Write an enzyme that holds these catalytic residues in place. Structure first.
Site, PDB file in Angstrom:
ATOM      1  NE  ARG A   1      16.086  62.217  35.014  1.00 23.95           N
ATOM      2  CZ  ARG A   1      14.868  61.685  34.930  1.00 23.95           C
ATOM      3  NH1 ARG A   1      13.826  62.408  34.514  1.00 23.95           N
ATOM      4  NH2 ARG A   1      14.719  60.397  35.260  1.00 23.95           N
TER       5      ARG A   1
ATOM      6  CB  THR B   1      10.361  57.121  43.991  1.00 26.35           C
ATOM      7  OG1 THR B   1      10.202  58.215  43.059  1.00 26.35           O
ATOM      8  CG2 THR B   1       9.069  56.322  44.119  1.00 26.35           C
TER       9      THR B   1
ATOM     10  NE  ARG C   1      15.075  49.862  33.871  1.00 25.89           N
ATOM     11  CZ  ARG C   1      14.868  51.185  33.856  1.00 25.89           C
ATOM     12  NH1 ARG C   1      13.920  51.752  34.619  1.00 25.89           N
ATOM     13  NH2 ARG C   1      15.616  51.958  33.073  1.00 25.89           N
TER      14      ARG C   1
ATOM     15  CD  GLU D   1      10.062  53.632  35.076  1.00 26.43           C
ATOM     16  OE1 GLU D   1       9.497  54.570  34.448  1.00 26.43           O
ATOM     17  OE2 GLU D   1      11.105  53.808  35.768  1.00 26.43           O
TER      18      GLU D   1
ATOM     19  NE  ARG E   1      18.298  53.315  37.274  1.00 26.94           N
ATOM     20  CZ  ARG E   1      17.895  52.247  36.596  1.00 26.94           C
ATOM     21  NH1 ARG E   1      17.031  51.384  37.108  1.00 26.94           N
ATOM     22  NH2 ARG E   1      18.349  52.062  35.372  1.00 26.94           N
TER      23      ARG E   1
ATOM     24  NE  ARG F   1      17.458  59.020  36.723  1.00 25.43           N
ATOM     25  CZ  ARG F   1      16.925  59.646  37.787  1.00 25.43           C
ATOM     26  NH1 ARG F   1      17.376  60.833  38.240  1.00 25.43           N
ATOM     27  NH2 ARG F   1      15.873  59.075  38.393  1.00 25.43           N
TER      28      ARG F   1
ATOM     29  CB  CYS G   1       8.830  61.368  42.993  1.00 27.19           C
ATOM     30  SG  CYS G   1       7.859  59.893  43.060  1.00 27.19           S
TER      31      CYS G   1
ATOM     32  CD  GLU H   1      10.052  62.996  38.419  1.00 27.57           C
ATOM     33  OE1 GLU H   1       9.557  62.544  39.491  1.00 27.57           O
ATOM     34  OE2 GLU H   1      10.347  62.272  37.441  1.00 27.57           O
TER      35      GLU H   1
END
Lengths: 367, 379
Positions: free
Chosen positions: A224, A273, A308, A313, A280, A120, A271, A220
């Site tokens: 996306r 980031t 992870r 997260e 990703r 994504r 953001c 956000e």
């Protein structure tokens, strides 16, 4: 008349990137410096002031871009944050995009090891403000620009648009069942920064009829987009992802619209980031044997890969299954970063097998 | 550029209609009163401090509610200029909220507690009383929009003025932003503390910003006169005690509020006040006197009467309770208060409580003796 000293925030007990990188001298320089669209430095940093967060878990970024002019307006402050977030020096130049999925080399893994995969990214529309500062009319425009360009997709990329603001109970149950729905932000970043204003006005969900290509409008970020499927066919996933993106952008341009892109930093989102490629690439990778090797984290970091659990997260290992992704967002191209995942996964699996056969992996490990 | 957002009226790409919110399904005052004509008119108009119309209405836009929760207000004042700037809109809300028309006028302040008649009650009946108001500092933006500096200024003004308070009106300031655990513990036990807002209005309006900066707590030595700085408003003054001496509570309340003002004038600082609508706070419910007088009143016999609410509503009062909190069920005891805020003065509104409470208590005794009360019930 007040001074900047009078308005300077006490960040002594904060734990976010903005607080580590903000000085009084920087505040005074940028305090009364305002972007073309009326965006302020206080507006860029306000969510970090409102969110000291914790020494205990997860240092956040604590700042946001308001529009495309925010970075270079507050350049000195932002380069500092970017280095901390990214290890990317002020003099570093993020390369040109590269969505050439034919040039990707063997991203087809064994379903036995790779249970599902995805890619994504985030994107913004150039000339519009970012979700923190943008207006209703801006948000409405973005929805037209994007929903209309997604309607121009044919083939396996053909889909339909589900506006949040006219959603029915029929379509909504479906989308929940598909796990495609999003709701109004309740988190601290998104609420305090302004990314929940005017809900559900301007937001929607678009997916292809194949349900392996999902887009969210005005959550956000403006855009996306996720490509996903079960099993180990990352290659089909990058194909789809690249093809939709390149085409979406093109139909956008026909209509006089383009994506927010900075020469040094690449693509822009709310953001810091979410920068460079804003990609990703990840897999859910089953690693029974490698799991139990001590040099497993060492290799990972050298491979430039993150791990992870398969729940986001803050989730640990379960059934020896990991969410493996590229760590970097800047400095490399989209497909270059997908290839890291490919080359890094290949090694990971071959080392798992080595241990299953009861063999050494000392000189399999990088450096 | 207060509101670090883009101003759609500046490009000339966007019309007002492009930015008009869809409030069809909203359940707040603001939504009931905003028209597309009124938006178009005020969209463009900006206060001298940079406060925008959307800034004022945003919280209503962001909090639509349901038929199931109460109808909220849905708007806010950014500064002293806000009402005037968007007056045709606001008068509508004010009239829904207050039944107060654009031709009505809120009278001059009256804090002469020596003209209050008879506010001392049996501790048997009135278990406690209090009086609270909210005030703002003239020439400064209100909590929704005010800067860190503005809020720091206010903290010092109000803290300096509480400073020069003497007699039974003397006490110490506890700023939040250098609070020790020692003082914090006391104040919790005292029920004097306050925290960062978590609720929908305060958050969405910008009233939780920069916490704990510019925020503090002042109280007097007797622990019965309490002031919160820069929480929901610049100023919140409460006078309170156990038992039934409302008169004392109002005296203390009146004298301090009058002395606090006086000391701020001394330093060239005034309370935010509109000749037509009285004292201005962030919420439009909080105008006129902004006084809430209340008692916790025991009505062991009057609970039971069918015309209890008919009287209360005719007395211009409202009931409620603080009994949810207590680990034991409280008695037949209600928080009774003046319903109105605008058309009458502070001491006048206190008297409406005194008077209604006098009737209420008489009616409870009346019932206890097996006697009828119909003739007692007002209109």
């Amino acid at each position: 008349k007040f001074k900047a000293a009078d308005n300077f925030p006490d960040l002594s007990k904060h734990n976010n990137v903005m607080a580590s990188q903000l000085t009084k001298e920087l505040y005074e320089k940028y305090w009364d410096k305002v972007t073309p669209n009326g965006v302020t430095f206080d507006k860029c940093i306000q969510t970090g002031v409102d969110n000291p967060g914790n020494k205990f878990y997860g240092k956040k970024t604590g700042c946001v871009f308001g529009d495309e002019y925010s970075y270079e307006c507050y350049k000195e402050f932002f380069d500092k944050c970017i280095e901390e977030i990214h290890h990317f020096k002020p003099s570093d130049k993020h390369p040109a995009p590269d969505l050439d999925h034919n040039k990707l080399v063997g991203g087809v893994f064994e379903d036995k090891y790779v249970k599902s995969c995805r890619i994504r990214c985030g994107r913004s529309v150039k000339g519009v403000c970012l979700p923190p500062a943008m207006s209703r009319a801006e948000r409405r425009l973005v929805e037209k620009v994007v929903s209309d360009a997604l309607g121009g997709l044919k083939g396996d990329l053909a889909g339909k648009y589900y506006p949040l603001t006219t959603m029915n109970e029929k379509d909504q149950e479906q989308l929940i069942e598909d796990h495609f729905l999003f709701e109004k932000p309740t988190g601290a970043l998104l609420t305090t920064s302004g990314c929940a204003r005017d809900w559900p006005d301007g937001r929607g969900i678009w997916h292809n009829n194949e349900k392996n290509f999902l887009v969210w409008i005005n959550e956000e970020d403006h855009i996306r987009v996720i490509s996903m499927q079960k099993g180990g066919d990352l290659k089909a996933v990058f194909s789809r992802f690249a093809r939709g993106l390149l085409e979406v952008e093109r139909l956008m341009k026909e209509c006089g619209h383009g994506l927010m892109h900075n020469d040094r930093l690449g693509y822009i989102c709310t953001c810091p980031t979410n920068m460079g490629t804003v990609v990703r690439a990840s897999v859910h990778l089953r690693l029974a044997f490698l799991e139990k090797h001590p040099r497993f984290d060492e290799m990972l970091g050298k491979l430039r890969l993150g791990k992870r659990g398969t729940g986001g997260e803050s989730s640990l290992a379960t059934d020896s299954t990991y969410d493996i992704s590229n760590w970097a967002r800047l400095g490399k191209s989209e497909r270059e970063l997908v290839q890291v995942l490919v080359d890094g996964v290949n090694l990971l699996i071959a080392c798992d097998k080595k241990l299953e056969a009861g063999q050494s992996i000392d000189d399999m490990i990088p450096k």
